[PDB]
Amino acid sequence: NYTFRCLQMSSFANRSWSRTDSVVWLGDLQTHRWSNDSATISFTKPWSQGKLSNQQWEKLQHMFQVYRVSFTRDIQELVKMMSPKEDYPIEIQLSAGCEMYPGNASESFLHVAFQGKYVVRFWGTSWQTVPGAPSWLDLPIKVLNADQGTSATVQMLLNDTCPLFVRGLLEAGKSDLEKQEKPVAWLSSVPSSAHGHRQLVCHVSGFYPKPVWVMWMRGDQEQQGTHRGDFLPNADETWYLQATLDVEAGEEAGLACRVKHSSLGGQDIILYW
Amino acid sequence: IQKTPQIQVYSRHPPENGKPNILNCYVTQFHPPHIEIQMLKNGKKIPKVEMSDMSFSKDWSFYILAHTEFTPTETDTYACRVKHDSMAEPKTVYWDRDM
């Protein structure tokens, strides 16, 4: 039940200035990096080589070392054939990877965004222009679609290699993907617009995995009205989230924060006093 | 094509005057992936600020977490300044003794 994604980012500002970096995730833990300046993929985890033998990992990394110098060179030929929207500053993203299911098979994907809009995909055996993708991209993909080797090599990485790799990881990573990290919590209140009604704030940080329950309570009374915000990250790969509640003075007494999270059992109830 | 970065400043542990902490600045939703993040303590820049690797969400916008080691003080202000193409001028959100 995990999603392995490998996001690549190519930036082409002009004929002589291109940069392509990449970064892989297993769920919400980053496992690898490939800075444009580094000649080899760097692991960002002890177990990011999966259950791959060096000799096989090394042979795999060579592929990318070859793909890179190439995709990059071919974009330059591509770009000359860029009418009508001749607009050199080109930013292209590529999200590829595979969602790993238990009973089901795994599901693979390759999405490509041009200038931040999604425009092309690899599908089964051929690369295809997705709706909304500009008119010119059609001649390039048709001439690309004649490269049997690439499209065979892709159907391999995509279909076969990706799941092989990913299970290895869920196997070696099991240690850090199963870590139950405990949260911390503190409250604070911010006054609102011009009026005597302020809003109580509950901050909860340092928890992992992502799934956490936070909510304002009045005794056993749950406060409908509490509004949970965005999950913000921390440098240690943990999470941040804060739930606010707009009150009215007077009756802030008795309210409190109940932080429910997997690592605990007997959870944080921070009364406002 | 072009989107203005949403900015978010917050600590890692409950701040407490004098106690060491970590100030996180999470920039997001921007595009292009060309932005200069700057963390400021009272107008001065903090020398060493760590940034994560830039990646993108499935909505294709980018994101990053610049962060540093900080200490909450009754007389000290901290902030995150962002420079992005899609911003006529630099956005500075300061930090509140709560987040």
CA–CA gap between residue B91 and residue B93 (Å, rounded): 6
> CB atoms < 10 A from the CB of A89, how many?
12
Sign of CA dihedral A245, A247, A249, A250: negative
Chain A residues with beta carbon closer than 8 angstroms to that of B60: 93, 113, 116-118
Chain A residues with beta carbon closer than 8 angstroms to that of B65: 233, 235
Four-way CATH pick for A1-178: 3.40.50.300, 3.40.50.12500, 1.10.260.40, 3.30.500.10? 3.30.500.10
CA–CA gap between residue A251 and residue A228 (Å, rounded): 21
Please indicate the experimental technique that yielded this structure: X-ray
Calculated CA dihedral for residues A158, A164, A170, A172, nearest 10 degrees: -130
Chain B residues with beta carbon closer than 8 angstroms to that of A185: 14
Number of domains in chain B: 1
Q: Under 8 Å CB-to-CB from A5, ≥6 apart: which residues?
A: A24, A25, A95, A96, A97
The two structure tokens encoding residue B44: 């001065």
Q: Under 8 Å CB-to-CB from A137, ≥6 apart: which residues?
A: A114, A119, A120, A129
CA–CA gap between residue A84 and residue B84 (Å, rounded): 27
Sign of CA dihedral A234, A236, A237, A243: negative
CB of B27 closer than 8 Å to CB of B82 = yes
> CB atoms < 10 A from the CB of A46, how many?
10
Residue in chain B closest to A186 (alpha carbons) equals: B14
Residue in chain B closest to A206 (alpha carbons) equals: B12
Task: Print the domain residue range for B39.
Answer: 1-99
Chain B residues with beta carbon closer than 8 angstroms to that of A113: 60
Round the CA-based radius of gyration of chain B to a whole number and report it: 14
The two structure tokens encoding residue B24: 């996180």
**Nearest Cα to Cα of residue A187 among A273, A262, A264:** A273
One-letter amino acid of A134: P
Contact A9 B96 (CB under 8 A): no
CB of A205 closer than 8 Å to CB of A221 = no
Residues of B with a Cβ under 8 Å from any A Cβ are 1, 3, 8, 10-15, 22, 24, 26, 31-34, 50, 52-56, 58, 60-61, 65, 67, 96-99
Closest approach of chain A CAs to the CA of B24, in angstroms? Answer: 7
Cross-strand partners of A121: A111, A128
Chain A residues with beta carbon closer than 8 angstroms to that of B25: none
Q: How distant is the alpha carbon of residue A181 from its chain centre?
A: 20
Interface size, chain A vs chain B, as Cβ–Cβ contacts under 8 Å: 81
CATH of the domain at B86: 2.60.40.10
The two structure tokens encoding residue A24: 């892989």
From the list B24, B58, B99, the residue facing A234 with the nearest CB is B24
CA–CA gap between residue A99 and residue A160 (Å, rounded): 13
CA–CA gap between residue A136 and residue A128 (Å, rounded): 13
**Nearest Cα to Cα of residue A261 among A232, A240, A235, A237:** A240
> CB atoms < 10 A from the CB of B32, how many?
19
Query: C-alpha angle with apex A91: A89 to A95, nearest 5 degrees?
Result: 170
Question: Cis before residue A102, ω within 30 degrees of 0?
Answer: no
Question: What are the Cα distances from residue B30, in Å, to A24, A92, A199, B60, B86?
Answer: 20, 14, 29, 9, 8
For chain B, breaks with the C atom over 2.5 A from the next N come after none
Contact B14 A203 (CB under 8 A): yes
Long-range contacts, B52-58 (Cβ 8 Å, 24+): B52/A233, B52/A235, B53/A21, B53/A23, B53/A30, B53/A33, B54/A9, B54/A21, B54/A23, B55/A7, B55/A23, B55/A25, B55/A30, B56/A7, B56/A9, B56/A93, B56/A95, B57/B28, B58/A95
Q: What is the DSSP string of chain B?
A: --BPPB--EEESS--BTTB-EEEEEEEEEEBSS-EEEEEEETTEEPS--EE---EE-TT--EEEEEEEEE---TT--EEEEEEETTSSS-EEEEPPTT-
The string over A235-266, giving b where at least 16 C-beta atoms fall within 10 Å of a residue's C-beta and e elsewhere, is beebbbbbbbbebeeeebeebbbbbbbbeeee
Interface probe for A, chosen from B22, B53, B68 (most Cβ of A below 10 Å), is B53
Residue A150 counted as an annotated binding residue: yes
**Nearest Cα to Cα of residue A8 among A21, A18, A17:** A21
Q: Tell whether A201 lies on the interface with B, counting CB pairs under 8 A.
A: yes
Domain assignments of chain A as residue spans, ordered by start: 1-178, 179-273
> CB atoms < 10 A from the CB of B89, how many?
6
Sort A68 into a burial class: Cβ within 10 Å, 0-12 / 13-18 / 19+.
Answer: middle
Q: Under 8 Å CB-to-CB from A236, ≥6 apart: which residues?
A: A206, B12
3-class secondary structure per residue, chain A: CEEEEEEEEEEEEECCEEEEEEEEEECCEEEEEECCCCCCCEECCCCCCCCCCHHHHHHHHHHHHHHHHHHHHHHHHHHHCCCCCCCCCEEEEEEEEEEECCCCCEEEEEEEEECCEEEEEEECCEEEECCCCCHHHHHHHHHHCCCHHHHHHHHHHHHHHHHHHHHHHHHHHHHHHCCCECCEEEEEEEECCCCCCEEEEEEEEEEECCCEEEEEEECCEECECEEECCCEECCCCCEEEEEEEECCCCCCCCEEEEEEECCCCCCCEEECC
Residue in chain A closest to B98 (alpha carbons) equals: A188
Class of the CATH domain delimited by A179-273: mainly beta
**Nearest Cα to Cα of residue A235 among B67, B5, B89:** B67
Question: Cis before residue A84, ω within 30 degrees of 0?
Answer: yes
